[PDB]
Design a protein around this ligand. Structure first.
Ligand code: AQ4
Lengths: 124, 271
């Protein structure tokens, strides 16, 4: 379904990407964080964790994840933890493995971001 | 046989639903001649391990020996109950938060505010005598309740349980900077609670919600990493300013103990 928005309407795909860009900055700019590139800026899990707290109304204690991950393994742990926060919030288990996000799979990343966007468009 | 069977869920009279959120549901009800609040907990991936843990954690909350501590009357074990459930007494004025910030009918005066402060300091000093400390108890204005005679009481029913996510913190404005960043086992938990009391003092002085204009994420990140602090209120006595500054010392080890500020607050009472 989302795969058709991805592959066989590449000017819709870019509009999906431009939609997801506006959405994440609406929230992350509150922390003075800017996203200009969806292909890489969520790969280390940090912005996904911060975004979840912004969307669902909590702070994430800094000992709960790696704010400055120093390894592929720590980035996988961050993404897995963000996936758990997603499930805490009512989303079903995400399809991609956490390593798919760490490896900058644009489809895996936009799928996760799109499911967040479908659920949370209207949060101020 | 088990040492506690807990409260029988079948004996609860559920009267009216008060609230529902991420953590569960609150109901007003009745049980064995008591007017109660029931909290039905929402838990993902409930398990026998988590249920065993719930049943070991709840007995510590049944504290009947201090006027400024509100006990959990008991808990429903799940199984056999549908969900892990807590029972406490209905407090007619609700939380301190509601009395200070959502009080549509009266504004408590500053003599009452100073009495609330003394009440809370006495209850915290008592809780800090327990060995070990009750874990996962966060002091803030939502976790203090106001009883029928306006006595403030620390709510034991508002503790967090081991199976509730430690990664989601919903009242960071009251949390000490070190506790936003370090695991509990790496902090002095008593000194962290004194920071929370300092923020309660600020709230009693300003009658404002701390950092009300910011999201919980913004609050935690800015307090932890950008040095955001409550602004010391203008036009208060040097004595109140001094107390609030020492309770909010950046160095946890320099903050007073609750049993040190109890006599200070006693002298601040009208009576
Ligand atoms: C078990 C348990 C448990 C766990 C966590 C929190 C609480 N909360 C409370 N506990 C005790 N008494 C309460 C009384 C309350 O209202 C009293 C009337 O206020 C004017 C009250 O209001 C909640 C909002 O209702 C719309 C909450 C109370 C109970």
């Amino acid at each position: 379904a989302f795969d058709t928005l991805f592959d066989h309407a590449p000017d819709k795909l870019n509009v999906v990407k431009k939609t997801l860009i506006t959405f994440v900055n609406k929230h992350l700019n509150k922390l003075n964080l800017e996203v200009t590139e969806l292909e890489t800026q969520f790969a280390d899990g940090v912005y996904l964790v911060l975004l979840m707290g912004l969307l669902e109304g909590y702070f994430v204690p800094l000992h709960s994840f790696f704010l400055t991950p120093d390894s592929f393994e720590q980035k996988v742990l961050n993404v897995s933890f963000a996936f758990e926060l997603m499930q805490d919030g009512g989303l079903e288990k995400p399809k991609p493995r956490p390593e798919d996000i760490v490896n900058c799979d644009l489809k895996s990343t936009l799928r996760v971001l799109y499911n967040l966007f479908t659920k949370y468009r209207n949060v101020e | 046989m088990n040492k506690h069977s807990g409260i029988d869920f079948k004996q609860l009279n559920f009267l009216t639903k008060l609230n529902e959120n991420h953590s569960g549901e609150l109901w007003k009800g009745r049980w064995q001649g008591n007017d109660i609040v029931v909290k039905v907990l929402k838990v993902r991936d409930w398990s026998t391990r988590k249920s065993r843990d719930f049943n070991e954690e709840c007995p510590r909350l049944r504290i009947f020996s201090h006027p400024n501590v509100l006990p959990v009357l008991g808990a429903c074990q799940s199984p056999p109950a549908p969900h892990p459930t807590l029972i406490t007494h209905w407090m007619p004025y609700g939380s301190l938060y509601n009395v200070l910030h959502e009080g549509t009918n009266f504004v408590v005066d500053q003599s009452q505010a100073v009495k609330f402060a003394l009440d809370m300091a006495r209850g915290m000093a008592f809780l800090h005598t327990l060995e070990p400390l009750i874990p996962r108890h966060a002091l803030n204005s939502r976790s203090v309740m106001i009883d029928e005679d306006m006595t403030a009481r620390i709510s034991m029913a508002d503790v967090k349980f081991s199976f509730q996510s430690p990664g989601r913190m919903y009242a960071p404005a009251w949390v000490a900077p070190e506790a936003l960043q370090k695991k509990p086992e790496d902090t002095n938990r008593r000194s962290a609670d004194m920071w929370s009391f300092a923020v309660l003092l600020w709230e009693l002085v300003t009658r404002e919600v701390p950092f009300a204009d910011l999201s919980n994420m913004e609050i935690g990140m800015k307090v932890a990493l950008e040095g955001l602090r409550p602004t010391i209120p203008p036009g208060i006595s040097p004595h109140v300013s001094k107390l609030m500054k020492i309770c909010m010392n950046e160095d946890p080890a320099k903050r007073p103990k609750f049993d040190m500020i109890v006599p200070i607050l006693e002298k601040m009472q009208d009576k």
